[PDB]
Amino acid sequence: EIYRKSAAETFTQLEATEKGLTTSEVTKRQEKYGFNELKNKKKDPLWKLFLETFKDPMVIVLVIAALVQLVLGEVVESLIIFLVLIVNSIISVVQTRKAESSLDALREMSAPVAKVIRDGSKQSIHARELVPGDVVILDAGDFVPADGRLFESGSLKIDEGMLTGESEAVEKYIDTIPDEVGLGDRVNMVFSGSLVVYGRGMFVVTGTASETEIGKIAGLLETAEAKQTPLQRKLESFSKKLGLGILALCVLIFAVEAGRVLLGDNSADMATAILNAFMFAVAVAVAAIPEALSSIVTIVLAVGTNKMAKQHAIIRKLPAVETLGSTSVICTDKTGTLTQNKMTVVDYYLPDGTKENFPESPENWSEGERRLIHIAVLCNDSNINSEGKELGDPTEVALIAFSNKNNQDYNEIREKFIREGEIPFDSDRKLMSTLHTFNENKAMLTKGGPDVMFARCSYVFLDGEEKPMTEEILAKLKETNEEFSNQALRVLAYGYKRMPADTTELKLEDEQDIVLVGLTAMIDPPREAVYASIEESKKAGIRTVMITGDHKTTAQAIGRDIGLMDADDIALTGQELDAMPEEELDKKLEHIAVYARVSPENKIRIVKAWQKKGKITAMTGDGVNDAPALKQADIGVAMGSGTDVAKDSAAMILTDDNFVSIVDAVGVGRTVFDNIKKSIAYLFAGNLGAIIAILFALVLDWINPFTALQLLFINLVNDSLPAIALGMEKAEPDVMKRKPRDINEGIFAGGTMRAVISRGVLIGIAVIISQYIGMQISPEMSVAMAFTTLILARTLQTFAARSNVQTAFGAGFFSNKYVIGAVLLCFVLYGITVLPGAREIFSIPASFGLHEWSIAAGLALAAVVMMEIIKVVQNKFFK
Ligand code: ALF
Numbered sequence: 106e107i108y109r110k111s112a113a114e115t116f117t118q119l120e121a122t123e124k125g126l127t128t129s130e131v132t133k134r135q136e137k138y139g140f141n142e143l144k145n146k147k148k149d150p151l152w153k154l155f156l157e158t159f160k161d162p163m164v165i166v167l168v169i170a171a172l173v174q175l176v177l178g179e180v181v182e183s184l185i186i187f188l189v190l191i192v193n194s195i196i197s198v199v200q201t202r203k204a205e206s207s208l209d210a211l212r213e214m215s216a217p218v219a220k221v222i223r224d225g226s227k228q229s230i231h232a233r234e235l236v237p238g239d240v241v242i243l244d245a246g247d248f249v250p251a252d253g254r255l256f257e258s259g260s261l262k263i264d265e266g267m268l269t270g271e272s273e274a275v276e277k278y279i280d281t282i283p284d285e286v287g288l289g290d291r292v293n294m295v296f297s298g299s300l301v302v303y304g305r306g307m308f309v310v311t312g313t314a315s316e317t318e319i320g321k322i323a324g325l326l327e328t329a330e331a332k333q334t335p336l337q338r339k340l341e342s343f344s345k346k347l348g349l350g351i352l353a354l355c356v357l358i359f360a361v362e363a364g365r366v367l368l369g370d371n372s373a374d375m376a377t378a379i380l381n382a383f384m385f386a387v388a389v390a391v392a393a394i395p396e397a398l399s400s401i402v403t404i405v406l407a408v409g410t411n412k413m414a415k416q417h418a419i420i421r422k423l424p425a426v427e428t429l430g431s432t433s434v435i436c437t438d439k440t441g442t443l444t445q446n447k448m449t450v451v452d453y454y455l456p457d458g459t460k461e462n463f464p465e466s467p468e469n470w471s472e473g474e475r476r477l478i479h480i481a482v483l484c485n486d487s488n489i490n491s492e493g494k495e496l497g498d499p500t501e502v503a504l505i506a507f508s509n510k511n512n513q514d515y516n517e518i519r520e521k522f523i524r525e526g527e528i529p530f531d532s533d534r535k536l537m538s539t540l541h542t543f544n545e546n547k548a549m550l551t552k553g554g555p556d557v558m559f560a561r562c563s564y565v566f567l568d569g570e571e572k573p574m575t576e577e578i579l580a581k582l583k584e585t586n587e588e589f590s591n592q593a594l595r596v597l598a599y600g601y602k603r604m605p606a607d608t609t610e611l612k613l614e615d616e617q618d619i620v621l622v623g624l625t626a627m628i629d630p631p632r633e634a635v636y637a638s639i640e641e642s643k644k645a646g647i648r649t650v651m652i653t654g655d656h657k658t659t660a661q662a663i664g665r666d667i668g669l670m671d672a673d674d675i676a677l678t679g680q681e682l683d684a685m686p687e688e689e690l691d692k693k694l695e696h697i698a699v700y701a702r703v704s705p706e707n708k709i710r711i712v713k714a715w716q717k718k719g720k721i722t723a724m725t726g727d728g729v730n731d732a733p734a735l736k737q738a739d740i741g742v743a744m745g746s747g748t749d750v751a752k753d754s755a756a757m758i759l760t761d762d763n764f765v766s767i768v769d770a771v772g773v774g775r776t777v778f779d780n781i782k783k784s785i786a787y788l789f790a791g792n793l794g795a796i797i798a799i800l801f802a803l804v805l806d807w808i809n810p811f812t813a814l815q816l817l818f819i820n821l822v823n824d825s826l827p828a829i830a831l832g833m834e835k836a837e838p839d840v841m842k843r844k845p846r847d848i849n850e851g852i853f854a855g856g857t858m859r860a861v862i863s864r865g866v867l868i869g870i871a872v873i874i875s876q877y878i879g880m881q882i883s884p885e886m887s888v889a890m891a892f893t894t895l896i897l898a899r900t901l902q903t904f905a906a907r908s909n910v911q912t913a914f915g916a917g918f919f920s921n922k923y924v925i926g927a928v929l930l931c932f933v934l935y936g937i938t939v940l941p942g943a944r945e946i947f948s949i950p951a952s953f954g955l956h957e958w959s960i961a962a963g964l965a966l967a968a969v970v971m972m973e974i975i976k977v978v979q980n981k982f983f984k
């Protein structure tokens with residue numbers, strides 16, 4: 106709104122004088138406005154990290170059963186629960202801590218030094234003291250400490266890449282603008298964190314700190330919204346159903362055993378039936394909840410971060426690898442990410458060559474030794490160091506890069522012909538040029554912009570020096586200009602300017618009668634491997650979308666090449682999104698597709714409206730502008746070349762720059778969840794039949810099976826080893842072609858439910874029979890023979906859970922070596938039970954035999970045989 110105001114109006118609006126504050130106002134200004142600085146207010150209290158972990162209903166119920174174990178006197182079985190609750194806690198507390206943002210990237214964005222006028226004194230003070238109404242000067246190389254509008258112009262160009270992401274300097278004009286334009290084309294004002302590239306200017310503060318756009322993005326980063334794992338929402342969706350399911354059972358256990366005292370014959374001891382009820386109640390709650398589940402998921406996700414490590418894709422947060430599997434919207438950045446941020450040219454215009462395509466040759470590229478050198482013999486001012494790091498104006502570095510791409514050294518021709526010209530300074534209207542001296546004559550070098558170059562150039566250089574041709578030469582270079590300018594190519598003019606001879610110095614007046622060698626038009630090309638990663642993204646069912654902040658002209662062509670959008674398709678400006686409310690936003694949202702010239706505020710709002718549509722999205726970017734879109738997106742990717750800002754605010758950071766690894770990552774995420782779902786289907790299926798045997802054992806007043814500690818043992822470690830084995834089953838890559846999984850289906854969706862219930866039933870059937878065989882012989886034996894049959898039955902379950910619709914035979918018994926490796930280790934754990942030194946604390950009777958075990962184990966065996974003969978029901982379902 107202030108851009109419209111200029112000169113005194115901006116100052117009168119601030120009621121501050123232009124030349125000097127006199128330090129009286131800044132004595133005061135710094136009290137109400139504060140220093141130009143950014144400071145975090147994160148409390149990060151220790152209390153909240155742990156109080157917040159109890160929000161999981163799965164966690165509160167275990168706390169209750171652990172306290173009960175204390176009153177009953179089973180201290181052992183209580184303090185084991187507290188241990189795996191510290192696990193469930195410190196797993197969830199440290200995942201979030203890494204997620205938290207840091208202003209370290211924000212730190213040093215604005216240079217401490219700022220030449221400002223205080224009391225009429227030209228002094229340089231720290232950017233902290235800078236306050237609104239102060240006047241700063243910007244010679245070249247300054248860091249633009251305070252956002253603001255500069256009344257005086259030195260012809261200077263500042264780099265706004267930190268705010269916007271472009272690596273090219275943009276000219277700054279002091280003229281007032283009366284219309285609303287996108288933040289990037291605010292040519293009359295500068296913002297904090299931008300680097301001044303050329304010239305010296307004087308500018309107004311226009312507020313500081315949080316008011317600055319560099320501080321408005323800081324407030325945007327401060328929000329730290331969303332980032333909820335689908336699994337977590339999925340888990341809690343049916344954790345709440347579970348957390349209400351156990352409490353339903355605890356009432357019946359009390360009601361049944363209270364229903365058994367009302368009908369109690371003669372004397373009935375209520376204290377025992379109550380205590381008898383607690384032993385069942387605590388047993389059910391233990392048997393239901395999966396103690397290892399948090400610790401197992403945290404491990405399988407460590408395999409994803411390891412498989413992506415070998416493709417130079419770094420993941421900072423484990424649960425994000427599952428988020429990749431469900432992704433359906435990819436939002437990217439045009440420059441710095443989809444590109445190498447490196448320009449060159451394939452279509453040069455010269456009269457003789459007439460080729461759209463670019464041919465690279467070792468001095469044979471141009472007819473005659475003279476033609477190729479004349480395009481830009483001395484125009485460039487860039488420098489390549491021993492390291493070779495980029496340095497110079499970006500438009501000009503593509504020249505010597507062009508020479509190096511043609512296998513022609515630039516150091517061998519830079520010394521052959523030497524600059525002699527004054528180099529008249531470059532300005533908004535003028536174009537800088539240089540003069541050099543030849544073996545026996547002299548030339549003047551002029552490099553211009555075709556819109557202003559051809560107004561002053563009459564002569565034309567082709568097949569020898571040719572007379573100025575006003576007609577038949579302007580249309581063909583207008584046709585070349587326009588066909589170029591329709592492909593969104595930046596064009597510049599190359600002149601020889603041979604008319605002056607033996608001139609001591611260079612005068613600006615002789616800009617006329619120019620001889621022009623030709624024209625070329627360079628532009629930024631995308632990665633070599635993007636073409637494969639968008640055609641695969643489309644073919645994977647993920648709708649890839651673009652959000653960049655560059656000109657619409659450049660944005661139209663980008664995506665036409667890869668096939669993202671049609672040639673007719675038009676992108677939307679950030680000003681249009683400024684005026685479009687949310688009411689029709691989502692109406693437009695599906696077909697919005699590519700954007701153009703957007704602010705950082707604009708990028709993060711898009712991902713928020715895409716999430717409202719239920720589709721879980723992903724963002725890939727770099728620099729500092731992309732950072733809010735990375736933090737808000739359900740998973741944010743960053744480039745290796747990108748600034749440490751986006752690098753430090755992304756859930757994944759690919760160092761190699763190999764884009765294809767992103768679509769490869771979506772292949773891992775869908776497989777990661779395919780195992781987890783299959784794996785979590787295993788762990789609860791065992792938990793079900795264990796509750797079934799506790800409940801049937803309660804309907805006949807049988808002593809509760811498996812005592813108390815034994816139940817905790819099996820879930821914490823006995824079932825952790827096979828759960829990880831399933832977590833590593835084969836990928837089944839054909840499944841990858843199918844469209845992203847909906848974030849709404851249950852964990853058991855896809856027909857697994859009918860398989861989890863089937864397995865959990867056949868389990869309890871056998872455990873009950875062994876208890877009957879056990880209870881007939883003795884009560885002591887029923888506890889062991891039921892537990893024997895159980896922990897063996899859940900161990901053998903792995904062969905059935907390898908696939909809900911697959912059999913071990915014919916699918917490869919030896920297919921997975923870890924499954925067989927995991928089953929063998931559970932056998933040893935069971936072996937440790939039967940030891941005499943540990944038989945006691947495991948409630949296994951001393952008078953336990955091998956023929957009795959034979960009956961029990963044989964029952965546990967036949968259970969999984971039943972799971973394998975549900976093949977017919979599964980086979981019948983298909984037809
Ligand atoms: F190309 Al960008 F932010 F670096 F849109």
Ligand SMILES: [Mg+2]
Pocket residue numbers: 270438439440441442726727728
């Ligand atoms: Mg970028």
